[PDB]
Amino acid sequence: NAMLYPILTQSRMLIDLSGTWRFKLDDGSGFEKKWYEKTLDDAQLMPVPSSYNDIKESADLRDHYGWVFYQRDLNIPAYLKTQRIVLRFAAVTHSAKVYVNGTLLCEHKGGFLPFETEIPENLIRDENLLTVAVDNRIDHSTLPVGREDESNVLSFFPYTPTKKQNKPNFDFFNYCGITRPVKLYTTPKDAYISDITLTSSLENNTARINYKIDTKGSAHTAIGVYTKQGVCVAQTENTGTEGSLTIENAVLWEPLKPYLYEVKISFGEDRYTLPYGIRSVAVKGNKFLINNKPFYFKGYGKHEDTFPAGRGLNMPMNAKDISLMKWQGANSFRTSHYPYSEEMMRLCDEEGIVVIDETTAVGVHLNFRVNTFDPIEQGGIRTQSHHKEVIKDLIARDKNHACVVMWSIANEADTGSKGAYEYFKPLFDLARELDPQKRPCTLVSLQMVNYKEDCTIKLSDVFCLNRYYGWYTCGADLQAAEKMCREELEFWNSLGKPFMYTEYGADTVMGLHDTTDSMFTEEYQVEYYKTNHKVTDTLDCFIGEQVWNFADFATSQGLIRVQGNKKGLFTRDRKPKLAAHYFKERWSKIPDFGYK
Amino acid sequence: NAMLYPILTQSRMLIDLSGTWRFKLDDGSGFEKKWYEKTLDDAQLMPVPSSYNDIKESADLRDHYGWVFYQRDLNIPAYLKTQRIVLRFAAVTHSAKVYVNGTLLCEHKGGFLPFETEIPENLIRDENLLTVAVDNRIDHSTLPVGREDESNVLSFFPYTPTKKQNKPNFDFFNYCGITRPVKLYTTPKDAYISDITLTSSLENNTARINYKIDTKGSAHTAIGVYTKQGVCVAQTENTGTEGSLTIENAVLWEPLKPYLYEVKISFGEDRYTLPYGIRSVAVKGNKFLINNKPFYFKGYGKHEDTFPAGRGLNMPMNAKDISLMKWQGANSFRTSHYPYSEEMMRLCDEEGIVVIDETTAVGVHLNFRVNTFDPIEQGGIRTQSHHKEVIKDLIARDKNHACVVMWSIANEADTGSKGAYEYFKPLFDLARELDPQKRPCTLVSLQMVNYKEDCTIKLSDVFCLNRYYGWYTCGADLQAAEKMCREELEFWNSLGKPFMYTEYGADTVMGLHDTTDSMFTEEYQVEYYKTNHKVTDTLDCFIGEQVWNFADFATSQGLIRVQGNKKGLFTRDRKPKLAAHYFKERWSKIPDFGYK
């Protein structure tokens, strides 16, 4: 469960296994014929990390259904065997089977969170083959959810598909493969650090770090806290597993003004250094408080999506995206609709970007007659069990990030229907139990005629609304959109708790224009946002605006998707639309703290 | 009924009243307050001819519901009163009331066909005001048909519109206004030509023109036929109303090789000259014969649509469009979905472009539970009576055009439902009765699950199909599209009569690309057409391909319309997409005659 980010330390090797791997589509016989026991024959080459769907020009590759096999050679020095040898997969989408030589080492379900496995030393021969089989199939038991009929979420006349294909119950393309880096790392065999938990206490004008260090084996523990320049500001040797350290002259991590201490931990020979921002988060009344100050979210729902790697880790684009958000005056984004790479989370900690951290739970809705949360034995959704593992794993991975201020339990589940509360109650209970910082929890609310029956009202600390007044309703009638927006949002405002837009927007094709309200035009995108803001700016409990979307991104094919989703403020190659300049202006006049 | 195109002759003045007119939106009180009796107060200026919707930047103007008032001064020489004075409206969309000074002169229904009225000389004062009130409203009794609920033909969540608006039952924007020129012309008072009918007889290797000259008053008739250089090749004086003339050395009008004789007619002092192409049209077996040769249609459904005039007469664009069709190797187009201007028809006669001439009958479908052709007293469609007047007027206007080879009675009516045959039988009977050339008649068939019950099979001389295999069905599954296309078209091919595509295409945004099948991309548009052609090229009764559409054009707003309809081979400003070059290549290898 514990998943420390792998780093090069005095006690820990870090070997990146990324590069060109061999790649072979499964044809139904791949496991029967035990392809993982030899070199892949008649194979292609595929970059790792990357989604595989867009690297070639093959529609059958892009739209492949089922398994693929990745493989590479792994010839490592024998003196590594004096250490504990670990294979870390930061993400394999959606499910993986990992083989070393002929031998199945592990299997994983869930395409967006890391997993790892020791390599037993009796298995390492002189030359080794690493094989990773990757399953892309989605159904009523996976997160994200796939449809199990021939229905498309986006048809006039019915037809029989040529081949079976995944049918996403979500509005983004089903990019799969070895999405994020594969690495080999080592620790001391006999005594090593397995996890680190840090929390902050700011009471009585005294900043303290509380630590809890999880180990394997028997040794002595030490912890030191260091400034960015390397001055030790607190340290203790031969400590317990738990304790606290006072940080005199503590500098707080603040949105757009990050400060990270370096927390170095020793256990026997093992050494691990964890960056850590000191800050508090709390919901009080109708305010979202960061370091006891009333925060206003300004930003976006995002996607991990770039050409040609798809969902694949793209670190230059990560840095470019954060630079664009600072240029635009944003302070935050949400990990729509899955955990993002640790490289992104760590960069956000470094750059002072606030993150709403979301699970993989999109598509938990069977009625976009069996109801979504009917009993499984009557056709209800089969995701609750995996939904708990995802929450456990997500919090275990990201718990120490200062940038994470809120957990989002699901995106647009069927939360107005019968049984939703009972499905979601244990998941909220679990997230509150597991997060040592006890951060606020929410689910992101689907737009819905019976919004007063949204079970978010009974569960969430912040109400997060996805609303499309002026796009999916009142299209090209913004005066009607304004009225419909005000009627519903005055209800939410009357509940006295913080609420916010986590999505709102309008599909906009760069280069289409009209001085007169016309859907898909750059001007309409601006007018859409002006209309919504006319309402939200008058509501004192509305504490944040995150647009849909930061940038255009790939989706499944359909009559309402113009080469993907076009609601980005930026294009897929990160060029500003008219509305992106509109937001730079607007967000320049709105402070991070004390707007409402 | 008779509607000779107005021309300047030795006996006929022609005064164009086009230019800047005064323009005022009605507010409900325009007739009550009798605005037509004075200058329009607090008015704008509007170009005539033009649609009014896009000239300004006002959404309320663009989306106006109801009446508008146009007005201009009309100060004419008194010596005109020695002649018969006629006001000709080439088109006023959709309905008009015409006033001179205070006096209602005529009212017209039908937005795409000419109407005229004598100006009684006792009404002409020294200074005169011409007022034209124009109604844009559409319903179950107009052609084209408007919906009478709040439904859009292209909604996720229901909303109340801010204002009432026209709801077209058709896929093009409801452009209205004084669409085509307004002209004053004169004839002799006492004896003048009211209509001319010409037909051709090619039997026995002898080309003859049969004439029938309709007059008012008592005088002597003469007719002469002249070559383009002005050589008289047949003539007779003091003739009857009907007769025939042999044309020795006759040159036939042929597709892409036009020849027009000039037919000059005298009656008393009146003189009228009519261009006339000699050619035959006939359907025999599975062949469409022009001048006894098996024709293959290559071209488009079009729209009259340019920026900013909308539906308005744009003669430079007409010439540009014909130049592009010759550049692409097309030979034909259909007047989708209304009669086009006489200026276009006459230019097509001059340039050798073959025309399928279509009525205004689009939207004759109430179920895109009351059935379309239920009795009117039970909610059935109320268009049949006006549908006959439109057919009468269209044939009366266009009967002498060599370029017109086929009448299209309706576009995508509900022809697979009960009662369609009975609705359409009298209209086909009427068109065959009225056309002196007895040209083939068709209706354009909607795509429909029960296509074997399409009443076109019982009525039409050529089966004209609108099909979207690979767009509205099988989208991004072209291999399935090919199979579905072949299954249905082998049925049509098995009937042994000529059939053809009058629409097929794929929405394509210029500048969107992908080497791998992706809807809305330029490459997908090409692949869509390749797939269809794989099938049609193997069917010996398939005698023509007209794409949807020649060029992108404006529509109502909705989630599936990217700033209008994007199925053009060209953009709205006439720039070629990838598929336009594809068709230039393809149509360069397909002959006008003897392809199948």
Ligand SMILES: O=C(O)c1cn(C2CC2)c2cc(N3C=CN([C@@H]4O[C@H](C(=O)O)[C@@H](O)[C@H](O)[C@H]4O)CC3)c(F)cc2c1=O
């Ligand atoms: O053809 C139509 O009529 C509609 C089609 N679709 C589907 C997307 C094809 C609708 C979807 C609705 N929901 C689906 C996604 N929710 C968020 O919206 C973003 C976006 O759609 O841009 C996604 O990208 C985000 O991931 C997701 O969180 C919005 C609400 C809806 F309310 C109405 C319609 C239609 O009306």
Ligand SMILES: O=C(O)c1cn(C2CC2)c2cc(N3C=CN([C@@H]4O[C@H](C(=O)O)[C@@H](O)[C@H](O)[C@H]4O)CC3)c(F)cc2c1=O
């Ligand atoms: O959102 C969807 O799912 C669909 C939406 N629409 C409507 C246009 C919004 C459909 C329409 C269908 N008909 C409507 C128009 N016919 C011709 O098509 C051209 C075009 O549509 O390009 C028009 O411009 C031409 O004038 C017209 O003759 C095609 C058949 C259909 F069969 C399926 C759908 C959908 O499935």
